[PDB]
Design a protein around this ligand. Structure first.
Ligand SMILES: [Mg+2]
Ligand SMILES: [Mg+2]
Ligand SMILES: [Mg+2]
Ligand SMILES: [Mg+2]
Ligand SMILES: [Mg+2]
Ligand SMILES: [Mg+2]
Ligand SMILES: [Mg+2]
Ligand SMILES: [Mg+2]
Ligand SMILES: [Mg+2]
Ligand SMILES: [Mg+2]
Ligand SMILES: [Mg+2]
Ligand SMILES: [Mg+2]
Ligand SMILES: [Mg+2]
Ligand SMILES: [Mg+2]
Ligand SMILES: [Mg+2]
Ligand SMILES: [Mg+2]
Ligand SMILES: [Mg+2]
Lengths: 51, 128, 215, 225, 109
RNA sequence: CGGGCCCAUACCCGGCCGUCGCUGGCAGUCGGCAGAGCGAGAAAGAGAGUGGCGCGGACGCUACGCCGCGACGAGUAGGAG
RNA sequence: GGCCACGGCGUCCCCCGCGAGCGCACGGGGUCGGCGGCGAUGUCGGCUACCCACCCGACCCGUCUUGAAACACGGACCAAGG
RNA sequence: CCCCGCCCCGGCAGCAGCAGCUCGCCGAAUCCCGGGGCCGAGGGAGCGAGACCCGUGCCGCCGCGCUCUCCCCCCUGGGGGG
């Protein structure tokens, strides 16, 4: 029977079913963004302390 | 305790009004039985705004619910007792219907046999 | 073997923090490598009989429905993840909006296992007893009570509060209410005018617009 | 006996499972390789422009070889020649999209169809969103949604493109089998442009929507998806 | 012991200049005069209350003359504070310019 | 000249009706005399041999029948079913 | 310091074919193993059919004609024949 | 106020800036969270033993966690972790 199409841009497991590398790509993106945010906030804190 | 069918889906009808013949309200010689307008200048035929609608094929009902009575069964006309063993094995999907010509003494027997066989009758207390 | 908590912390829903071989190393799979009724005899008083624990049906209907295609994500109501609004914390003052107690300011205590809020209300203040309410049909005002130093009896739950079947108030309900209300009253007597605020009733008057007023 | 027949069947199933795992690893590594290749492509042009600016000269990038074309006007009142070229471009309905590779012949055809289309140079993100969100295949002359990699493999494996990742790779960096990939792709059925159009009847340069947006077609795609 | 429902006026139906779509209703809530100000009322359920000749049953009371058609505020309309409402039965055309009760309890505050 | 907003039977998603195409699928309901399959990227065997207790298993197929995939739907004079 | 579709022995030539279990789910189209009320002479249900009101739309059919609502012709109404 | 040359483009913040608006184009150089509305089409997809078996109704692809190795930590045999 006809299958229901699901949007891979919004559906993580469908995106993985069509491209398994998306998982590691997204994990790297999330980790890098978290690290960058932490660096930015600590740099701002150090700058305001040094003010 | 009326008998229930096997399944009772939600019957959806794309239209409940009837398609009346054009301009039948203005005349008595014209019945409401639908006739397709064929005039060269007929606005109903040309499908102008705000006019009488025509019976397209897109109005056809669902095949799963087509001919289903509001009770959930489908009618079958029966004239005597021997035509109820026909519905014996279509018990939960099909009901019986006694003809207008059957007399009271035979309607009683048909109703009794149908009650025995658990076949639903849509006009069980017609004449008495 | 003794079970262990999952070694893969979640980053977001569905994505673990560590990679596949990182988990391989953490689980240490390198050193864990591995390699390759129906009838009961019941005695009878000539010989013995064999009894069938399952007997074939004695009546078959005229017709039967086919089976259903089976899906995956559908769960019973008992195990849905239950959420609460951030503006609602134990001790906040709510406004009932639906029932016979509509418009009465009350006190929030806890959220039950069915997702229904457990509201107390002081009987001496606004005649609202230990009651369940729905999270949606309330308004969370910005007024809190330091309720953390209050103990709610464990035995009171959804099974307790559910309707049974003229209604009579049981002594168990009365004593539970007495305990909880005696525990809660002094803590709200410490806030000036709060008892009067709880005793009053919320209503809308001329020119008063709900979307303009901070609740 | 059946004792060894059962084990033969189980061995066959195990072989299928191992082959499937091998294919999964292959497509995963291919996706990673394509990611690195895209990153190199994107940094190389910037580096060349920077070195040209340092040297004081100018670096003219290679003119784009891929285009995305959208039919803007409707079906009523069309010249026969415009109609024929639209039919050849596979835009038989309003708001259909189609990738086109750009050469002299295609550019002249687009110049003919200039009043009836809006087109430009799509981004890698544009290609990805179009392929995943609204990507359908032409399998046994049927419009079939690409809900798994086997549909692409069975119809394009002969060209050594196995997954939607290297399908997107071919479409973006047009290769030896871009013609076959595009013909496999059914014309994209985009929606109405959310946020409104400027003017359907006029060229982009005069503030309308016809003509060739260079890289505003990416904004148009974002709105039409 | 007071009003717990906001005041709204059934302005008219969803329409163009020459076509009317009866399944959607347009409402003026008082005090809201901006699209960015209508956000509070999205999803709130609304009711139309009227009287008839003979009695009908009421939840938690003896039958009386009152009848109600229920609805729900779907999304905003225009820039001046209109909203769109969808009722389980299309509002009668005699209710143009009459009071529609807009409730508060489907709340997300 | 700029944001926002309103709506056609147009476009997108979904349901239902019919037509067209796949000149698609189903005789495999082969059950204790039995062993459940033909959907999956890449031709062709669930091939045969020769030497080194408890008695059980839904519906179906008026084959002019039933079922599944996609696309399509204006219409006078006129033609056909 | 951080990351990974890295994970055994055996030699020969190059440079340098079947592990067992469990369980969770963004996974080939919705379920609740969730609830609340009201019902005997006045109430419940009846998308259709009878009357009325309101909003929007809406010129009288057939016919010749490039062009018909036409200040173009045929037509009071009904039944039977055609 | 605007200009020249030297001082490491004089140095220090930061950086298409939450001094939420002085001026762009973006996302393989992109991810997370939340709210409103509409919809629920289909109905025997099998799983495991197997001539030693006649169970079962969670099944396929896809993404995972735990045990068949052994230690240690926290909060109360249970859960959370290294
Ligand atoms: Mg004409
Ligand atoms: Mg035109
Ligand atoms: Mg808009
Ligand atoms: Mg009153
Ligand atoms: Mg559609
Ligand atoms: Mg059409
Ligand atoms: Mg036609
Ligand atoms: Mg009018
Ligand atoms: Mg008129
Ligand atoms: Mg004439
Ligand atoms: Mg003339
Ligand atoms: Mg005329
Ligand atoms: Mg005139
Ligand atoms: Mg005359
Ligand atoms: Mg004449
Ligand atoms: Mg006359
Ligand atoms: Mg006659």
């Amino acid at each position: 029977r006809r299958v229901l199409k699901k949007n891979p841009l919004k559906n993580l497991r469908i995106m993985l079913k069509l491209n398994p590398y998306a998982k590691t790509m997204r994990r790297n993106t999330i980790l890098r963004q978290a690290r960058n945010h932490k660096l930015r906030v600590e740099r701002a804190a150090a700058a305001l302390a040094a003010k | 305790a009326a008998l229930r069918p096997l399944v009772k889906p939600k019957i959806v009808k794309k239209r409940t009004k009837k398609f009346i013949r054009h301009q039948s309200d203005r005349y008595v010689k014209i019945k409401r039985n639908w006739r397709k307008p064929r005039g060269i200048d007929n606005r109903v035929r040309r499908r102008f705004k705000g006019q009488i609608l025509m019976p397209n094929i897109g109005y056809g009902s669902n095949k799963k619910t087509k001919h289903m009575l509001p009770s959930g069964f489908r009618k079958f006309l029966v004239h005597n007792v021997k035509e109820l063993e026909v519905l014996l094995m279509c018990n939960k999907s099909y009901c019986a219907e006694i003809a207008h010509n059957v007399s009271s003494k035979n309607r009683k027997a048909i109703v009794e046999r149908a009650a025995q066989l658990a076949i639903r009758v849509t006009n069980p207390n017609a004449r008495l | 073997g003794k079970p262990h908590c999952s070694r893969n912390p979640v980053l977001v829903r569905g994505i673990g923090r560590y990679s596949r071989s990182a988990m391989y190393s953490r689980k240490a799979l390198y050193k864990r490598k591995y390699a390759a009724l129906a009838t009961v005899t019941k005695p009878v008083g000539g010989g013995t009989r064999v009894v069938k624990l399952r007997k074939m049906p004695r009546y078959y209907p005229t017709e039967d429905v086919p089976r259903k295609l089976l899906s995956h994500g559908k769960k019973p109501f008992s195990q849905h993840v239950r959420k609460l609004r951030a503006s609602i914390t134990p001790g906040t003052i709510l406004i009932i909006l639906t029932g016979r107690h509509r418009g009465k300011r009350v006190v929030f205590l806890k959220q039950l296992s069915s997702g229904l809020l457990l509201v107390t209300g002081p009987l001496s203040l606004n005649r609202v007893p230990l009651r369940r309410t729905h999270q949606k049909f309330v308004i969370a005002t910005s007024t809190k009570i330091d309720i953390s130093g209050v103990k709610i009896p464990k035995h009171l739950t959804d099974a307790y509060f559910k309707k049974k079947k003229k209604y009579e108030i049981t002594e168990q309900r009365k004593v539970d209410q007495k305990a909880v209300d005696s525990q809660i009253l002094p803590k709200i007597k410490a806030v000036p005018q709060l008892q009067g605020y709880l005793r009053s009733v919320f209503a809308l008057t001329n020119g008063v617009y709900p979307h303009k007023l901070v609740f | 006996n059946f004792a060894e027949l059962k084990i033969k069947r189980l061995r066959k199933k195990f072989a299928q499972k191992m082959l499937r795992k091998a294919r999964r690893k292959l497509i995963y590594e291919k996706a990673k390789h394509y990611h690195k290749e895209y990153r190199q492509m994107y940094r190389t042009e910037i580096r060349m422009a920077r070195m040209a600016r340092k040297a004081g000269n100018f670096y003219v990038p290679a003119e784009p070889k891929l285009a995305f074309v959208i039919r803007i006007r409707g079906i009523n009142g069309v010249s026969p020649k415009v109609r024929k070229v639209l039919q050849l471009l596979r835009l038989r309905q309003i708001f259909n999209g189609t990738f086109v590779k750009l050469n002299k012949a295609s550019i002249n055809m687009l110049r003919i169809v200039e009043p009836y289309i809006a087109w430009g140079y799509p981004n890698l993100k544009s290609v990805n969103e179009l392929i995943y969100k609204r990507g359908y295949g032409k399998i046994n002359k049927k419009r079939i949604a690409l809900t798994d990699n086997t549909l692409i493999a069975r119809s394009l494996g002969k060209y050594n493109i196995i997954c939607m990742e290297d399908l997107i790779h071919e479409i973006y960096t047009v290769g030896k089998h871009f013609k076959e990939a595009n013909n496999f792709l059914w014309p994209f059925k985009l929606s109405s442009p959310r946020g409104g159009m400027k003017k359907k009847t006029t060229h982009f340069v005069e503030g309308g929507d016809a003509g060739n947006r260079e890289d505003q077609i990416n904004r148009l795609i974002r709105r039409m998806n | 012991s007071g009003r717990l429902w906001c005041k709204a006026i059934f302005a008219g139906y969803k329409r163009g200049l020459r076509n009317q779509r009866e399944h959607t209703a347009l409402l003026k809530i008082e005090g809201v005069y901006a699209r960015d100000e209508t956000e509070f009322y999205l999803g709130k359920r609304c009711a139309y209350v009227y009287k008839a000749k003979n009695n009908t049953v009421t939840p938690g009371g003896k039958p009386n003359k009152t009848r109600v058609i229920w609805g729900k505020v779907t999304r905003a309309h225009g820039n001046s504070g209109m909203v769109r409402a969808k009722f389980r039965s299309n509002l009668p055309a005699k209710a143009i310019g009459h009071r529609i009760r807009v409730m508060l309890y489907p709340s997300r505050i």
